[model samples]
Target: GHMPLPTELARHLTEEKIAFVQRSGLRAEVLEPGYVRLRMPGAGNENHIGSMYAGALFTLAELPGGALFLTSFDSARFYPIVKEMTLRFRRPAKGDIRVEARLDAERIRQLETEAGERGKAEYSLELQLTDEQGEVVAESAALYQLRSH
Candidate 1:
């Protein structure tokens, strides 16, 4: 099942705080609960090749997924951060790009259970960046370390 937006994310989404995202020209839209979507406009975020830059794609893929993952946990218990990332650029992003990141509930529950007992747990999330036509342009998997204070 999906979870509500965490405090950090809710704060980031406020109009006054969107500057952080506007700096990267990335906009995020929360879909239902577990799924989050990000869109990067082609104009300002484009590379010298007149295509979406790889760095921009990577950043977009990271933040939304990270936010969603954080929201999946109890606010006062666990803090999650990306520990490592592996990315594969399948093709040049020729137009505006969309990135979708979702959390696996069963896996998260397992991780949360372990973390609640052991103080730390590791989980991996996969994200995809697609072109306007819905063709995959890049794929990334990130490992996150969740810790209890």
Candidate 2:
């Protein structure tokens, strides 16, 4: 639980923020347009140890990036894809995990616009998970490619 406040809002979006959540029982909300906060409830994401699982963490981690991408621009302008992502786990969350996502609107739009004008644009993103102690338990970053339609 020593990580920081993620890297950026590029960590930042709703059901779209947690679209996959719609299919599952996990509930999430868009605290901020680009930034998202989610809870990996024990009902669906709990590990055999009664802790939040990594696979659930994986999806919770990516949710924000997709949310941010959707809100980055007009859905008709271009296509946004997660070009690549890198992640690491430092601790196990034994409680219902709280995940937060952030993103920089200016940077996200700039990158996507660059891709729209050209062919592709790559951007970096960050995400976070919290233990019951209110400290960071897990952290990650991601890469996305804004491609031409």
Candidate 3:
């Protein structure tokens, strides 16, 4: 059987299951095998300078790895973990922040096959963190590993 594309329920469960995500008001704008887009609400995440807090920006950067995994892999058979991540702030985010990640369908299949055979598979992502205006605010590079159960 193949993995199903994640729906609003998946997003809801993710927020409900991860308390921090719930508190941060992250929303899934898109969730599909090989792709994910997330948004961090701007209201409660204001920094002392009135911009989005740095920590919130980092969370928005890192969460896509898990979101991608949820859509692309079978949780009963595999799980993903972040190995390392880096974030670069290009400009202060004054409002809602969004980020997206994508993998080719071929690459998604490759990772699944590799994890199933080798017990673990590694992947990397480079994401552009954007604001509501579609301006780039920050950039993120993340390394993730998918482990077989």
Candidate 4:
């Protein structure tokens, strides 16, 4: 329904042109429609505090959440922009981190239906970043506004 990876995205990913993603060695794989899993390796993302940098955690959280939301829209008809974001860091990320972002299918369907009738929709996405041990290190929720151009 809203889950195809576009050519442009592939090119960007392949070219390592997504600045933060490239810098952080973030790797993403689509798990299902509207769901993605991302990983940040430990090599390049170390902080002065000897843990995963806070910005890296936040970036990892935002990337997949933003990507899934934007890609869920009809590329020819709409654009999505992050409206707000909130992040909570629970503990130091001592190793590689894995982040998962997925849309609530029911909510997405509702928003799509409303947008079809009203021409605009606002949606929120939740993302969680955890260490290899499955302990959550950070969590974030972001809101995006999508409208036809």
Q: Candidate 2's residue-wise lDDT over 35-72, tens digit each?
A: 66777665666778766777777776777665555544
Stronger candidate by TM-score (2 vs 3) = 3
Model 1 has an lDDT value of 0.74
Taking the tens digit of each residue's C-alpha lDDT, what string does model 3 give over 55-90? 999999888788787777778888888889998999
Would you list the C-alpha lDDT of every candidate in the order shown? 0.74, 0.65, 0.86, 0.74
- Residue runs of model 1 more than 4 Å from their true location after superposition: 1-3, 6-20
| Model 2 CA deviation exceeding 4 Å by range | 1-20
Query: Which rank order by TM-score, best down to worst?
Result: 3, 4, 1, 2
Please state the error at residue 30 of candidate 2 in Å: 1.7
State the lDDT of candidate 4 residue by residue for 1-149, as single tens digits. Answer: 46556745743562276765686777765544566777878778999988999888888877775566655555566667778999998888989998877766677777777777788888887777889899998889889876666
In what order do the candidates fall by lDDT, top score first?
Answer: 3, 4, 1, 2
Error of 2 at 110 (Å): 1.6
| Better structure of 2 and 3 per lDDT | 3
lDDT of 1 by residue, 1-149 (tens): 23466545563562125465668767666543456677877777888887887788887777775567545666566788778888899988987888877766676788878998998998877878898999999999998888877
